Structure formats: structure tokens, C-alpha cells
Symmetry: D2
Subunit: 291 residues, 4 copies
């Protein structure tokens, strides 16, 4: 069918490639060079978001921020500069929950359907179609795009109306960040107390301390494996979205605010491009004691 993809970064490119290899028809547009492998599968690289839209019935979007999603939709040569009657816009960018509601609304007033469906899983998840997809929007629309979500991901969930997808993603990033920080506090304390991080993590696995973070990341902190799986610089962007929403909704998120500052400490000490599990280096530095 006629699908369009705007934004082909480390996530967008492989996602589009996945839809193209599934036999779907695609016109794409990105700030820069398109992947040979993508055009190699039928994809047609056009010049603007407006043209992707004039062609497709379902438009996918993968841009860095709320402003890009904003520009792509209503910019000078964007998706709205052409009729959107009967179309479906699927933003899979991680952007403001509040701005999303507004966007989805004005695209509705132009006769189009809106689906906000931010993802999690990183570039590996995107290459292998195992992305986690939290979706905001109406069921019927969700059902309609689902076959496509299936190619792109594994865990797909309709969380509610427009905006809940972005919102669900913010909540996931808050917990992931707070969970990583807790394991860091608990293990660095255990280590400086004289206990063996390996054992404690094992002991704590059976019980209420158990979580996927303690399982995967706790391991990385011990083994010192910090190769990018999700760069700290990226999680800082995610928490920044969290805090700004908190400010707009008047929410007091004491530990999300601190985690952001803890990440600032990682940056200042060469951790911006390491895996967010390296968050542990912050507490080690602060206690002067590595695992």
C-alpha cells in the first residue's frame, strides 16, 4: 500500500527499510542521504514532506523533536500544505505529550486521522523489528495500521487517545532512568560496604528488588560493558521532555530531576555517548569507589 516515511536517521532508515522489504510502496524524505538498501527496495526519495503526503495514505514520521514534528506537519512545504482528507498520520517520534494533543487535533480538522506512537528499543530494535510501540489514538485507526506496526515492532499497545502514546513513553523513560539510578546506588553502596556486586545482584533477583534493569543493566555495571545500546545523551533528551512536561502540568518529580543532574555529571566526565548503564560511574565518582 501507499506508505510514506519522513526522517531516516538511525531509527527511521531501518524502520522504512523494514516496511519496504515487506513489499509495501514507499516514498521517503530525509535531511540528507537516503540508504542505498532502501532505494534498492523500491523506495522513492522525494524532496519534501508535502510530496510524501500527496502520495501516501498513511504517513509515518521519525524526527528528533517536537519542533520538527511541528514543522513537518504544518511547515512551509509540509504534510498540511496538501489535502489530508482520508489520510492517516503516524508520528513515531518521541515528543511533547501536550503538543501532540494539539497537533493531532488540527490534523483532524483537516480531515486526517492521527496516531502518536513513540517507540523504544533503539537502533537494534529497529533493524530487527522488535521495537516496543506505545500508541495514542482511536482503536479503529490503530487496528488499521497494526499490520504495519507488526513489521516494525513486537510489543504494541493502544494506551488510549491521542497523546497517551507520547505520555506512555515519557513514563517508561522516567522509570528506566530511576531504576538504573537505584541499582547504581544499591550496588555502589554494597561494593564499598565490602559485599560482592555479583552475589548481591543474584540475591536481590529473587524478591521485590527484581526488575529488568537489575537483570540487564546491573550486569553491565559489574562487567563494565558500556557500549551504546541507548546513549546517555539520548536519555537526557528523554528526561528533558519529562521535566518540561512536569513544569507544564505542575508536577513535582524529585527523582527524575536528580537523575537528569546525575546524567549531567556523566557528561562532564565523558559518559554522554556510553550506555545509560554507565550512570553508575556518577555514584562511583561521588563516593570515590568503583565496583
Amino acid at each position: 500500500m501507499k506508505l510514506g516515511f519522513i526522517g531516516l536517521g538511525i531509527m527511521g532508515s531501518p524502520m522504512a527499510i523494514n516496511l519496504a522489504r515487506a513489499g509495501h510502496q514507499l516514498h521517503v524524505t530525509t535531511i540528507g542521504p537516503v540508504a542505498d538498501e532502501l532505494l534498492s527496495l523500491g523506495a522513492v526519495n522525494v524532496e519534501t514532506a508535502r510530496q510524501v503526503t500527496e502520495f501516501a495514505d498513511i504517513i509515518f514520521i521519525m524526527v528528533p523533536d517536537t519542533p520538527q514534528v511541528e514543522d513537518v506537519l504544518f511547515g512551509e512545504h509540509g504534510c498540511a500544505k496538501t489535502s489530508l482528507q482520508g489520510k492517516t498520520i503516524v508520528d513515531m517520534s518521541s515528543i511533547s505529550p501536550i503538543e501532540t494533543k494539539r497537533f493531532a487535533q488540527r490534523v483532524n480538522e483537516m480531515g486526517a486521522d492521527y496516531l502518536d506512537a513513540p517507540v523504544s528499543g533503539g537502533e537494534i530494535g529497529a533493524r530487527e523489528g522488535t521495537l516496543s510501540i506505545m500508541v495514542g489514538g482511536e482503536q479503529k485507526v490503530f487496528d488499521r495500521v497494526k499490520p504495519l506496526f507488526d513489521i516494525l515492532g513486537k510489543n504494541i499497545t493502544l494506551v488510549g487517545g491521542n497523546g497517551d502514546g507520547q505520555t506512555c513513553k515519557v513514563a517508561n523513560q522516567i522509570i528506566v532512568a530511576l531504576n538504573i539510578e537505584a541499582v547504581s546506588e544499591a550496588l555502589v553502596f554494597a561494593s564499598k560496604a565490602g559485599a560482592d556486586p555479583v552475589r548481591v545482584r543474584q540475591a536481590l533477583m529473587g524478591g521485590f528488588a527484581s526488575s529488568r534493569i537489575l537483570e540487564v543493566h546491573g550486569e553491565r555495571m559489574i562487567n563494565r560493558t558500556f557500549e551504546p545500546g541507548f546513549k546517555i545523551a539520548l536519555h537526557q533528551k528523554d528526561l528533558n521532555l519529562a521535566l518540561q512536561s512536569a513544569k507544564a502540568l505542575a508536577l513535582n518529580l524529585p527523582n527524575t530531576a536528580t537523575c537528569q543532574e546525575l546524567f549531567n555529571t556523566c557528561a562532564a566526565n565523558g559518559g554522554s555517548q556510553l550506555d545509560h548503564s554507565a550512570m553508575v560511574q556518577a555514584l562511583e565518582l561521588m563516593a570515590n569507589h568503583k565496583l
Copy 2:
């Protein structure tokens, strides 16, 4: 063998009752009145402490705080002034890791083995024999008491040498607290953002936000079911061990520090006696938005 129990009450009592129910002969003692059940089960309520240590090779201690464990060990009517040669003393209280280090070697230089095996599971855990037990000590000693631990709980884990048992428990309590607070910040936010907590929780269940806390405690927050399972006042006393240990070992535990303060807000608003899942109320108060 022939055992001894030096602390009854909320948890020591049902624990003694389980050991007595397995055929063991126990010489118990405590400040309060020995429950009839264990009296009429073989336990001999020898009027005081030094005595339990006499007719018993393995002595179980289940007292409230670090200082009371020290007096039981080296007090006038204590285990001191009595031969300790060829005996095994096992403290199952949750006390100071650094302290345990020295209580142990003190007892060790008196001719006895020491196992610090703090426990978690609460009242219901002690009665049911399903307590989680983290142990610090020498393997053979652990192996010797093992059959008894088997009667007292399911998850028994030898964490390392003397002190690592306590260190393991503290680490457990830090993560349970930080994880509970994390789910609270994410859901209160998701809620005030307009999303349905049941939904978000459902989504985050399949990814990296997944935890034993979001599953159980998450639910407790949504259905507003806070009947005790583990009192906030209790988790308060525990976080105090972590913070005092942290202070002694010079560790910067920022979110644990904050969590203790948030618990202060709960106690300030009638949450001291509720399940620590009641934590969520602190953030609801700070955001003026419940659920």
C-alpha cells in the same frame, strides 16, 4: 540440633513456632509474654538470655535494632560470660552492616561461629516459612544451619562473609524504596497528563520499565489498596540504616536520601501505618492530583 531463640514478637515468635513445629527443642526468651502456641509445643521459656545460650548449640536472635543485638551479645545477662566455644550464633535482625562486622569477630574470638542472616517478607512471611534470607558467613557454618533456614523461608542465599548478609538486606530496601518512588512519579505524571494508569502500567510491563514493583505495588496504587504488607514506618527505619551506613562509608545516596524525606511527608499525612506502596500519596500531594 538443640536450638535457642533470643527474640520473639511480631516475627521472632512465628519463626520460633516454625522451628518448634519441626520437632526441635527450643529454649526461648524475650521481654514480652511467650505466645502459648510455642510454649505448648516444647519451647522452654527460660526466664532470661545467658540461659538460652547454655542449653543450645545454635542461637537465633530476632531483636529490633543494632544496639539491642549488641546487648544480647555482650551484656550482663547476655551470651557473654557464658562459654561460647563450639557454638553458632545467627542474627536474623536487620541491623548495621559495619556493626555486624565487629560483633562477628568479637564472637569469633570467643570460640563461636557467626552468621548474619537478615530476613525480608514480614509477618506473613515468617508464619508461612517463605521468608527470603540473605546470609553472611563461612559456607560450612551456613551449610550447618541451612536445614533450619529451610524451615524458616524459601529464598536462602549465602551472599558472602560476615556483614554481607546485612549489606545485602540494606541494598534490597534501597531498591524497593527507589523503585516504588519511581512507579509513583511515572504514574502520577501519566495520570495528570490524561492517560490511564492501568494502561501505561500495562504497556511498561513489556519492556525495560518492567519490575516486580510496578507489577505488585503498581497495582496497589491504582486500586488504592494500601493495607499493610510492609509499613512505611518500617521502611523508614530501614532507609535509616542505609543512610547511616552511607554516612559512615561516605556514600552519596541522593535518591535514597530523598525517598526517606518523602516517607516523612507520608508519616506527616497519616501514611506511617500503611503499605509502603502508599508512597504514591506523597507525590499526589505534591502535584495536587491523585490516582
Copy 3:
């Protein structure tokens, strides 16, 4: 000389009025309606921006945020596309320190001097000509505009080169926030402890706790007098500059981070429009104890 004002409103207006009242001829502009007072005082409300820059050697900018200062500088109807040679541009807005660094050198390579001179004192300060002014730039340039600053405020201070003016303002706002929060934690505590805040405040006045904040704001908290002097919503926008700057420069500002969250609790409970001394209410809420 011949001056220009590019931003009126809450503060820009009374500032322009003070310059006009001193005999200077001002070519002003802003989105809203120019107050009659300055119109009937010499100010020529030249319909737009590029024009103010033409008939004026020193241009004053008093716009809300960093981006609006950038558009005034390099926008279509902006100071750009107009010779800037031999001119002096002075931004008195409180914007981003890092941004100002580049706006400055941009203007500098166009043939003009730049002074970033953020101000503090609020509405009443601007009307009364008693604003505090921190300035970043070259001394001779500062010396040139100095006579005008003298009309606008009392405390004028050349802090350093371009950008240090903004950096100085942010530093001011961090301490005012942290000091206000400190007095709040100490007095709420002293109060709930049974002591009289008037007393404690009186004592701490003669020692190291002494501050310009405990003196003024301390009083405001006791007599419950929170009528605006400086809105929390305003100090919120400011703490956001500090936190965004902190994030860019990779600084861990833990208490500033928390203060911003506590302000979120105030906004959540109708304090957005009150004097930032209203901060105390956040801790009163968190302790369930007022005064």
C-alpha cells in the same frame, strides 16, 4: 545620544519612559500598544523593528525569551539587513548565557558593539529607576552606555565580557531560590518543633545564617504576606535558564533542580502568581504544618 527601544511591556515600557523622561529621543517598537505616556513624551512608535535600528546609535532590547531576542537580532524585520556599523546594541533581557555568546560575536562581525545587561528588580524597579544591572562586554562600550544605565537603575556592575552579564543574572536567581528554600526548611522545622519563627529568625539574624533573604523573605513568610514582588512563575522561567545552561555545560545543580520541582508544587497549589517567598507553602504542604 539617539536611542532605540525594541521591547515594551511590563518592564520595557517603564524603562523607555525613564529614558524619554530624561530628554532622550527614542524610536520604540513592540507588538502591543505603546503606552500613551511615552508616546506623548517624544518616543516615536515606528511601526516596526528594522526601523528602530536605523535612527538610533544605541539600541535597547527588552523581549521575553532567548529566541525572541534572536529574531529581533537576525530576523526579516530585525536589526539585520540594516547597517549595524558604528552602533551599540544592548540586550537587557534575561536569556541564555551560551546563546548571548554567539549573538554577540554575530553582531560584532557586522560592525557593532554588544552589551548583554540582564536586569533584576521587577516592575517597581524599572519604574523607579532602581534596577540592578549586571553587564557583559567591553569597558569603553560599557562606559558609553553607562549614563543611560544610570537612569535605569542603581546597582550597575560590569561583570566581564559578553555573556558574563547573563551568567551573572542566572547565578543571582539560583541563590535567591536556594536561599528562599533554605529559610523555608529551617522555619517550617523550627515551627513544627514548637519554637516561634519570629524568635529563631531574630536569632539567626546575628551570625552566619544572616541573609538578605531571611531578613526580607523570612518576614514575608511569617506575616503570610505573599503579594507579588516577583512571581513564582517568573522565578520558574529563570530556574529553567539555569537548568538548561547547566545541562549544556554539564553541571550537576541538585538543589536548583529540586527548587524548580518545589515551585512545581506551588503552581500545582495556586502559588504561580504569588511572591516567590510563597515557596514556604510547598514545605508546609509536605510537612502538613504551616507558619
Copy 4:
């Protein structure tokens, strides 16, 4: 007159010496050696607190903690082991506000008057009689001891009834600690922003950022002068008193809790014996940037 002094540490010794050089009669007792200069002035070193009390009408006490004050008053050979009818006990130790109320009460029931009057100013303040004295108790009693407070200090204040003195001291230590941390955040940010710490501190002096901490300590942070004036290890003790009271009174003191953790970071990095102005090294470490 007949005065007694219990505790002759770095504070107590010079304080007692000051009362002895004023021509007063003194019997003292300390854990250890008494100063030659003190006995040199008439002071009689007795063996126990009970004997100091049997002799004096007004008993001064300078011990490290709530437990010592406790023991000195009701211990096996303390002040209460002798009649206290008509006497006046003056505790100048910094201890729990809550425990104090209880102490003062039971000494009242034994016919004696109680005055809690913790001090601030350190050992220099004690040698030179410039100590700051915050007093809890009844006026008439305060008036009666005042002549003595005059020899010992400079700033003396009756803050209210028994306990308010300790309480007033806790509040002073919270503010001092929070104020020091704020200057540290503001200056380290300013420095990494490129501004000159010297100028900013000067700029900020005129305005609401002004406080004694910014004046004295801000200077020490720039000049790097960290020679003990008040050891961080000591301020950690003071904040520890704060937090435990917070726990007992159910108070949420978010920035006091963090400051304690920030100090833990100083300890772990050799700052336990430096002046609490060295608190700034924590943030520098955390941002990887010294002033």
C-alpha cells in the same frame, strides 16, 4: 560564684577558662586531662559530674551528644545522683531538641532549673568570648545566667522555652549548610560558564543574593582557603541532628538531606577535616571543573 563545668574539649576548656579568668569559682570534670591554664586559675578538677553538682549552684555542660548530656544528668554518678534543689543546669551542647524537652522536664521535677543554650562560633569564638548563644528556657533564669553568657559570648538570645535553644541551633545549621551549597552551585556554574567568580560574587553582593555566607565563604571558595573554622565532619553531625529530628517530627527537608549527601562526597574525597566552605569541591567534582 559556684559554677561547674562538665566537658572540657576544644570548646569547653576555653569556655571554662574564660569563666575562671573572670574570677568565678570552678570545679570541673572531663574525660581526660584538664588544661594547665584552667587549674592555674583556681579551677578544681574533681572526678565525676555528681561532685561538680554537689559543689555548684549553676552547672554548665559541654558534651558531644544527646547520649552524653543524658548520661551526665542521670548516669550512675551524674548530676541527678545528688540533690538538685534550687540549682540551675545549663547545657550548651548541641543535641536533640526533643530529648532536651524531656531532660529539662525531669530535672525540673527534681527541683532544678534548666537552660538549653547551644552555641556557634567554633573554638576561636570560644577562646575570644565571641560565641553566639541561642537559649531555651525561662526569662528569669536566663537573666540570672546572662552575666555568665556575656563572658562566654557576644550574640545571646532567649528564643523561648526549653528546647527552643537546641531547635534554634538546628535551624541555624540547616541554613548555613544550605547557603554554603547554594553559593557553591552558583559559583561553579558561573565559572564553567566562563564568568569570573570574583566579579559575580561582587555583583551579587548588592542584591537579594547577599548573605554572610556569600561574603565570608564565597571568598574562601575562590581563594581556596579551607583551613578548619568548622570541620565538615562537624557539620555532618549537625545535619544528622537535623534529619533525625525531621524524621521524628515527620518533616520533609529535601535540601538538608541532599546537603548531607553532598558532605558524604566531600568525606570520600578528603574533605572531612577541611572547612565546610570546601563543600564547593563536591560540585566541582560533580561538574569536573574547579574554580
